[PDB]
UniProtKB/Swiss-Prot annotation, chains A, B:
Changing K86R: Loss of deubiquitination by USP44. Changing N92A: Strong decrease in c-di-GMP and cGAMP-binding. It comes from Homo sapiens. It is linked to STING-associated vasculopathy, infantile-onset: An autoinflammatory disease characterized by early-onset systemic inflammation and cutaneous vasculopathy, resulting in severe skin lesions. Violaceous, scaling lesions of fingers, toes, nose, cheeks and ears progress to acral necrosis in most of the patients. Some patients have severe interstitial lung disease. GO terms for molecular function: 2',3'-cyclic GMP-AMP binding; cyclic-di-GMP binding; DNA-binding transcription factor binding; identical protein binding; protein homodimerization activity; protein kinase binding; protein serine/threonine kinase binding; proton channel activity. Residues 1-193 are cytoplasmic. The cGAS-STING signaling pathway drives sterile inflammation leading to type I interferon immunopathology in severe COVID-19 disease caused by SARS-CoV-2 virus infection. Tissue damages in the lung and skin lesions are caused by activation of the cGAS-STING signaling leading to aberrant inflammation. Endothelial cell damage is also caused by activation of the cGAS-STING pathway: SARS-CoV-2 infection triggers mitochondrial DNA release into the cytosol. GO terms for cellular component: autophagosome; autophagosome membrane; ciliary basal body; cilium; cytoplasmic vesicle membrane; cytosol; endoplasmic reticulum membrane; endoplasmic reticulum-Golgi intermediate compartment membrane. This is Stimulator of interferon genes protein.
Amino acid sequence: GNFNVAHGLAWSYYIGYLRLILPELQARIRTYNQHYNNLLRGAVSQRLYILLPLDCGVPDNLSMADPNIRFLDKLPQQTGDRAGIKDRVYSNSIYELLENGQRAGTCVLEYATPLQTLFAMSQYSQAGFSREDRLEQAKLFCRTLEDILADAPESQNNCRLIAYQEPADDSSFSLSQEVLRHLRQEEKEEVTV
Amino acid sequence: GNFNVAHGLAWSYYIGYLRLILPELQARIRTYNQHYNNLLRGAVSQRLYILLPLDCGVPDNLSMADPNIRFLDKLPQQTGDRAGIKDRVYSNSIYELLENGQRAGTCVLEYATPLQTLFAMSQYSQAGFSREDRLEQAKLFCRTLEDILADAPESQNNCRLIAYQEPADDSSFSLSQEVLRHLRQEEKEEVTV
Ligand SMILES: Nc1nc2c(ncn2[C@@H]2O[C@@H]3COP(=O)(O)O[C@H]4[C@@H](O)[C@H](n5cnc6c(=O)[nH]c(N)nc65)O[C@@H]4COP(=O)(O)O[C@H]3[C@H]2O)c(=O)[nH]1
Ligand SMILES: [Ca+2]
Ligand SMILES: [Ca+2]
């Protein structure tokens, strides 16, 4: 019946994590851009880019997904407040996106960790949760998280969801291209509006 | 038609937390009890006690809801793995339960963290989530988690849910006394079985 784990997962992810880290993340990115743009020959986008593989495949490191997605630098932390903000642990990692060995873009990137739960659920037989259930909830997770972020206080502008199914043959899918296409569209939006 | 956050919250709580902390819990408690017995003739119960206040009120200090519930120690981490078998580092607290100033029991005690999500949602206006909704979802949370632990590999024997609805009239609920009942029933079971 009407059992959708994705509903709770998306709400939990926003309330217990994204809501808490997005303002501080944008603040650190801005500062980083101020001190290091001369060094970067560009700018890190201020949107957290969230990877949502619909196959729920989350690797411990990003480069084993795509050798054109490569660690660049660390985002410095917040400054000497320590007044209640430091609860979650999130990635201070900036990635560069490569095209032909050349840096084509830069962003803060991370996977949507609740997809791990759906994967775990699908390997846990007592849950009675099929691969087909997993994909269905993964999609529902995306839709739900999207709706939440649409009405969220300036957080729609604070992150970008990158949902993607991967070729059920084996074409060499390019995640780096997927991300770059969003980066280019974002800069285009930022500049034509 | 049915949006039930509690479903995903309970699955997320078992998958992302209980499944990982519980298999090694009783070993951690056992090695603490060796010292606890030798040093104070103490015995800490072997089950994780999970407070589920139906009103979703989670304080950042247990002792603030009851000074008959007195902090004793952190439960020390496991051994062998440099990685941790299943854990990075789980903070778990051991508490003494007091009756008329006297130590009457000892257990690893903590609130069900997903109740905070339910509480935050009910203060988040974009959620259209009322305090009546929260309670119904809190009940569903307990029910769902219970069903999960019942099918779960020995994790059911590893923990005990303490779900309580507090009297609206600001009557004299004793949380310490509620916990002691469970502790006294646990000892009765282990001693009769
Ligand atoms: N990248 C990143 N993502 C984060 C972080 N914190 C939370 N998230 C994401 O948001 C989800 C919801 O977290 P939650 O509301 O704290 O909800 C948690 C919480 O209620 C509970 N839980 C998890 N770890 C602990 C713990 O160490 N102690 C206790 N008492 N509860 C825990 O189980 C729920 C499910 O946890 P998850 O499966 O891990 O699911 C997490 C996770 O996917 C973070 O610091 N970094
Ligand atoms: Ca993949
Ligand atoms: Ca209460």
